């Protein structure tokens, strides 16, 4: 949730979606930890999804 409001306060300060390198110097944590947070699996796709 913190990463989802920091990366959207930099959407309207830079004009485009930021990069994990730039969140690291903004959230004050290493890029490896941010890459782990962004790699957290979202809600799984339902198997009844029309494909």
């Amino acid at each position: 949730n913190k990463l989802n409001r920091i990366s959207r306060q930099m959407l309207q300060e830079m004009g485009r979606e930021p990069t994990p390198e730039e969140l690291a110097e903004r959230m004050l944590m290493p890029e490896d930890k941010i890459r782990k947070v962004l790699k957290i699996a979202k809600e799984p796709i339902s198997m009844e999804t029309p494909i």
Partner: protein, 1340 residues
């Protein structure tokens, strides 16, 4: 007269009607709409301005705060079309809106603000349309197909007498807005009006009238007329209007002033009415029993005590008359009812109405809309006011208001977008009038009732949805206590708006993948009208009346071109000349016919204006000045058509092509084809694969150049000039002096697309058709795209065809093909495939792209470099490794025999798993391109560094050698300028070139031109520098890959697919067929000169299908090739140019009174030779759609060569040398190769991967899947006695887990025996039924 690109090869036109209107730009329906979308409009009418003005300003809950809109602008796209197609992102422009936040001052209605803060806030990116009407959305090109939906307004449908036993028509009305609820009215079998909202439960129609603050007296005043009775001291005389007595039979004597008019039992005839009007009777004496059933109008109360004598809407009787007699009332108002002209429907509905007040009606409405909760007064009032009378939750349209006023015969076309009391009253009144007998019910299939949305309108709707989504949050944020000295950027989240726009463009039914296997496929996909989509009908709930072709489709929607199948009549195609109204209604051009002449002025008429006039036909002869040469002409007046005098006509059709689309106007001799076959041919003409060499259509229509140029496959010169340099991938045009701007150096550089893949994995390739030092002019083509020959569309090849049966090899629809067709590579096509190898980050470690793959020999790794990626140009077949990748794995945990084997042989296991990318089995291509994408944290291997070095070198080289050409052109311009006005013959080349742009002249604008050229050159140098830096920083930068994947390697293979038995070929006349044999050359039938035929077609397919157009195309192709052979013989003997002139002119002078005079005597004896060299493979012939060449002209052309006019020649047998007993029809027909190749259809499986829940094989050929043995095949096996075949079908071959392994072992052990068991799907079924409360079990 003739363009330089068309003097090369002039197609002989057989059309006879002169053209008045040239075919418009075909893709102008896609380009105008999106242009209206993103366009700075000073008035808030179109596009983003309308959305911003219809949402902003956002005002808080009276908190003295306001966020208001100022302007907007689209930024520059980060990547252009090619870069975003390569990388795989969207081509879009950042939208940057400038807002203004104002805080008011307390105790002020509209007082001066205390502070203003104007800031520019970024809200989302909107995708941009390319030059051709397509969108690049995720690297792929997509088309937003237009939609045909019902226009907003009020539509008075009916019931056609069904749905009831007695057979009563139950007329209904329905108000459809663009956004809001549906106010349906209707009738029940008892003739009581009813209203239902949002198709909910039915309510009496007077409830809404009461909710609109109407009493009962006011309702009876609105919907009825009064009959003024009076107490004239005796007999209750009433005022009489003679028209009220029409259709009545009085049982008494209608006697006024002692004069007898109508006797006892006499019907009141028209003569009686006329007599009453002549005598001017306004008062009569009626019997006291005449009021025995008359309904009173108003509330009559007692004069003495105020008690209610009779309420409004209650029938009077004798006692009621007595009670109102001595009370003191003399004027009695009663309603005018009837049975034929003035029905009492509102009175009966009031008598059924449960409510009696406004609040009761509102409560009943609330209970209908939201049942189950206690209704408050203010809650019900808010619901009713927010239903139809709120600007936010309801908007009709501008179109809806226009149609609403037109249907009600009002005079204004503009007004409020929300309903009012007058609108509802007028709809009810017109429905009651239709019930009475006057007025007609609408038809919902008329093209005056259906409207066309496009890309701009739908995109604007989705943008407005996103805007209201963000306005909710902005309104919440401003009222949340904070003051707060914040900027207009902390309240706006760009994710709702951008999410809505991405949802529309990427995931929508009308936003679909482009068909890119033809110029025709793209053009006909962009000009497509679809009745489906969000806001339209579905393929299952659609009836028969929307599928049919209406009389108003004439000139607006093609009748034949529609897909055959589940949606036939729902995916219509736009006609050639059809346009779209200011409101969205299709319209077609007609030319005005004045007093007696057909003028050239063209008016566009929609489907409702068309019915008023009588419109002549395009097949009408004019006497060279305008007059109709006949005395009466055939026209269509109101749907139906008949013959009218020439003094009655009002308009005339522009062309004979205006009724058919651009795909059905490419079929020669269309009028000889059956409509089913024409539909099939139109639908199959856009599946044709572009072959290795586009030929031309030898019998065309003249619509080929329009389709080829108005698409985007060719390269068309922007300005005229002289070709300065041609190459396989670049054309440089030196612009003429009179077409150059005063500042720039005029040279145009055209970079050609070379060997890229389309959406259908075909090949896209532009090759130049001009030569060095050759004059071009504006609009001439410079390069040919896929399926284009010298600017003309060329879908297939024209080949010699015989119509005869040949030993059963063309039995049903099969085709017998010679071996010359496969030797000459006539139907060889190039297919390009993209194969990707993603290296992800697993839990046990990352995956590498090393070439050191375990368990593979040195022979398999011979085509890989040291980096593990295949070389470019390597010829790889099925199974060859392209990209070598190895994934780490855990512990094998091998079996006792396996570990004994390892102990004996000492070969330890490998900790990595071979997961390399390899060529799919069956295909054999050549690697033409390798692209490597790397995450911006990973070291680049040597291959990626080599690719980067190549890309940087190519970028620098391209910019350097564009700046060289531009600099050379600018210095040539400077040198040409210096020749005049300060002439310097040889005083110029000694000094260096850089000093030519800083020399002085006289006090004129020539010095300003020299300085402007110098400034342009300096700007070019700095532009080269900045573009080089941008390209370097864009090439060296990392990639934005998906989360998890480290690097992606993409390999492109080009496959040349020759023709073979099983491939599907066709023609333009709906004659498809799968070729069956490739016959040798000496086995094909041959004529007297030994020339074999190329294709042998069955004559039996012609009479039963009535596609006679192919026979005439065969004869005309034979005639055209005969002319070409005569020219070729004259050219091989190198006779003279006078002989060529004479023969080519004689060939162009046929036939009977045609247009297109050529006049070959103005040619320059070297343009005659290029023409004759281009006509030596056959003279092209233009046969228009319904104008065409008569067969007499075909006979004349056959005579002009040396061919028989029969069209049939004596043919011999290649295998026996004996002539066939009858002459056979030989000629040239234009064959196509459809995209139904047999190497994409063949599949086979024995054992593969099985599904997850039900252990059954998967789906076909993508995951190596089995064939479905469905229920009908089970019935077929039960109809035999095949009980064992069925049992192995449903147990061992499919689902039994133990049995299939046992059967495989048995088969490989030479024993064919089954041990069936029970399928796993039945166990799944038992568990699923048992996981309900039910206990199902197997018992013995």
């Amino acid at each position: 007269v003739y363009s330089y690109t068309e003097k090369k090869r002039i197609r002989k036109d057989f059309g006879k009607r002169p053209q008045v209107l040239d075919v418009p730009y075909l893709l102008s329906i896609q380009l105008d709409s999106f242009q209206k979308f993103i366009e700075q409009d000073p008035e808030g009418q179109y596009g983003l301005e309308a959305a911003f003005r219809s949402v902003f300003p956002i005002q808080s809950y009276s908190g003295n705060s306001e966020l208001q809109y100022v302007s907007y602008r689209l930024g520059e796209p980060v990547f252009d079309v090619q870069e975003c197609q390569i990388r795989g992102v969207t081509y879009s422009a950042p939208l940057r809106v400038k807002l203004r936040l104002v805080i008011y001052e307390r105790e002020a209605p509209e007082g001066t603000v205390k502070d203003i803060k104007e800031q520019e806030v970024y809200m989302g990116e909107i995708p941009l349309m390319t030059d051709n009407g397509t969108f690049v959305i995720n690297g792929t090109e997509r088309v937003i197909v237009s939609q045909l939906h019902r226009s907003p307004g009020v539509f008075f449908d009916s019931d056609k007498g069904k749905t009831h036993s007695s057979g009563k028509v139950l007329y209904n009305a329905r108000i459809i807005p663009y956004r809001g609820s549906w106010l349906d009215f209707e009738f029940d079998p008892k003739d009581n009006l009813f209203v239902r909202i949002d198709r909910r439960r039915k309510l009496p129609a007077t409830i809404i009238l009461r909710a609109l603050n109407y009493t009962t007296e006011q309702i009876l005043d609105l919907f009825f007329e009064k009959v003024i009775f009076e107490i004239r001291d005796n007999k209750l005389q009433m005022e009489l209007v003679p028209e009220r007595l029409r259709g009545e039979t009085a049982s008494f004597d209608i006697e006024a002033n002692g004069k007898v008019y109508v006797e006892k039992g006499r019907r009141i005839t028209a003569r009686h009415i006329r007599q009453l009007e002549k005598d001017d009777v306004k008062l009569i004496e009626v019997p006291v029993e005449y009021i025995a059933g008359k309904v009173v109008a108003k509330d009559y109360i007692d004069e003495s005590t105020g008690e209610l004598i009779c309420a409004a809407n209650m029938e009077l009787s004798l006692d009621l008359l007595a009670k109102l007699s001595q009370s003191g009332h003399k004027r009695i108002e009663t309603l005018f009812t009837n049975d034929l002209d003035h029905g009492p429907y509102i009175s009966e509905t009031l008598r059924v109405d449960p409510t009696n007040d406004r609040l009761s009606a509102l409560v009943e409405i609330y209970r209908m809309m939201r049942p189950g909760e206690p209704p408050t007064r203010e809650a019900a009032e808010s619901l009713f006011e927010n239903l139809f009378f709120s600007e936010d939750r309801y908007d009709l349209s501008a179109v809806g208001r226009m149609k609403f006023n037109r249907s009600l015969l009002r005079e204004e076309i503009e007004g409020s977008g929300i309903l009012s009391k007058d609108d509802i009253i007028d709809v009810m009144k017109k429905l009651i009038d239709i019930r009475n007998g006057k007025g007609e019910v609408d038809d919902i299939d008329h093209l005056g009732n259906r409207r066309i949305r496009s890309v701009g309108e739908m995109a604007e709707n989705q943008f407005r949805v996103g805007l209201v989504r963000v306005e909710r949050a902005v309104k919440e944020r401003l009222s949340l206590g904070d003051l707060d000295t914040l900027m207009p950027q902390d309240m706006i989240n760009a994710k709702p708006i951008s999410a809505a726009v991405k949802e529309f463009f990427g995931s929508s039914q009308l936003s679909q993948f482009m068909d890119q296997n033809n110029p025709l496929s793209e053009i006909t996909h962009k000009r497509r009208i679809s009745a489906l989509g969000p806001g339209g009908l579905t393929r299952e709930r659609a009836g028969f009346e929307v599928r049919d072709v209406h009389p108003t489709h004439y000139g607006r929607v093609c009748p034949i071109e529609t897909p055959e199948g589940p949606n036939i009549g729902l995916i219509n195609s736009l006609s050639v000349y059809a346009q779209t109204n200011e409101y969205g209604f299709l319209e077609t051009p007609y030319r005005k016919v004045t007093d007696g002449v057909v003028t050239d002025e063209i008016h566009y008429l929609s489907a409702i204006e068309e019915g008023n006039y009588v419109i002549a036909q395009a097949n009408s002869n004019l006497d060279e000045e305008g007059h109709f040469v006949e005395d009466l002409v055939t026209c269509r007046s109101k749907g139906e058509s008949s013959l009218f005098s020439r003094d009655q006509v009002d308009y005339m059709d522009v062309s004979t092509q205006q009724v058919v689309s651009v795909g059905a106007s490419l079929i020669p001799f269309l009028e000889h084809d059956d409509a089913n076959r024409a539909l099939m041919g139109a639908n199959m003409q856009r599946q044709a694969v572009p072959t290795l060499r586009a030929d031309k259509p030898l019998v065309g229509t003249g619509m080929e150049r329009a389709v080829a140029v108005d698409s985007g496959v060719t390269a068309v010169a922007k300005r005229g000039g002289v070709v300065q340099y041609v190459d396989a991938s670049r054309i440089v045009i030196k612009v003429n002096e009179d077409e150059m701007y005063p500042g720039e150096a005029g040279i145009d550089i055209y970079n050609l697309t070379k060997y890229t893949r389309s959406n259908q994995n075909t090949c896209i390739n532009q090759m130049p058709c001009v030569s060095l030092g050759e004059p071009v002019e504006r609009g001439d083509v410079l390069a040919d795209g896929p399926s284009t020959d010298l600017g003309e569309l060329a879908l297939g090849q024209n080949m010699r065809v015989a119509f005869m049966p040949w030993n059963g090899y063309n039995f049903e629809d099969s085709i017998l093909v010679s071996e010359r067709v496969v030797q000459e590579d006539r139907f060889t096509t190039i297919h390009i495939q993209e194969l990707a190898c993603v290296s992800r980050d697993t839990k046990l470690g990352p995956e590498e792209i090393t070439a050191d793959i375990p368990n593979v020999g040195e022979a398999a790794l011979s085509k890989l470099d040291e980096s593990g990626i295949v070389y470019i140009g390597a010829e790889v077949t099925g199974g060859d490794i392209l990209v070598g990748k190895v994934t780490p794995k855990g512990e094998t945990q091998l079996t006792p025999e396996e570990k004994l084997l390892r102990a004996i042989f000492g070969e330890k296991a490998s900790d990595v798993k071979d997961s390399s990318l390899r060529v799919p089995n069956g295909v054999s291509g050549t690697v033409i391109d390798v692209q490597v994408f790397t995450r911006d944290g990973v070291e680049k291997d040597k291959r990626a560094l080599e690719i980067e070095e190549m890309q940087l070198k190519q970028a620098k080289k391209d910019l350097s050698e564009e700046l060289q050409i531009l600099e050379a052109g600018l210095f040539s311009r400077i040198r040409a300028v210096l020749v005049a006005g300060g002439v310097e013959a040889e005083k110029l080349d000694k000094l260096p070139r850089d000093r030519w742009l800083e020399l002085g002249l006289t006090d004129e604008e020539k010095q300003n031109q020299l300085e402007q050229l110098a400034e342009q050159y300096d700007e070019l140098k700095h532009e080269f520098e900045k573009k080089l830096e941008a390209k370097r920083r864009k090439i060296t930068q990392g990639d934005d890959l998906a989360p998890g994947v480290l690097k992606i390697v993409k390999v492109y293979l080009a496959v040349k697919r020759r023709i073979q038995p099983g491939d599907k070929m066709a023609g333009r006349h709906g004659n498809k067929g799968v070729i069956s044999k490739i016959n040798p050359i000496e086995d094909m039938p041959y004529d007297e000169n030994g020339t074999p035929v190329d294709i042998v077609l069955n004559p039996l397919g012609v009479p039963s299908r009535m596609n006679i157009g192919q026979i005439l195309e065969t004869h005309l192709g034979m005639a055209a090739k005969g002319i070409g052979d005569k020219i070729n013989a004259m050219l091989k003997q190198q006779q003279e140019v006078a002989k060529l002139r004479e023969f080519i002119q004689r060939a162009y002078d046929l036939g009977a009174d045609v247009r297109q005079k050529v006049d070959l005597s103005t040619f320059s004896d070297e343009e005659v030779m290029r023409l004759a060299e281009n006509l030596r493979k056959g003279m092209p012939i233009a046969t228009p759609v319904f104008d065409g060449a008569k067969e007499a002209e075909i006979k004349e052309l056959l005579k002009l060569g040396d061919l028989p006019t029969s069209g049939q020649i004596r043919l011999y047998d290649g295998r026996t040398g004996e002539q066939f007993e009858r002459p056979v029809t030989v000629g040239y027909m234009y064959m196509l190769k459809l995209n139904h190749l047999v190497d994409d259809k063949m599949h086979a499986r024995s054992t593969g991967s099985y599904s997850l829940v039900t252990q059954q094989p998967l789906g076909g050929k993508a995951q190596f899947g089995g064939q479905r043995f469905g229920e009908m095949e089970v019935w077929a096996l039960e109809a035999y006695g095949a009980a064992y075949t069925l049992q192995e079908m449903l147990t061992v071959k499919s689902d039994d887990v133990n049995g299939r392994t046992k059967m495989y072992k048995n088969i490989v052990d030479g024993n064919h025996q089954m041990e069936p068991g029970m399928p796993e799907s039945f166990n799944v079924l038992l568990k699923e039924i048992r996981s309900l409360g039910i206990n199902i079990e197997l018992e013995d």
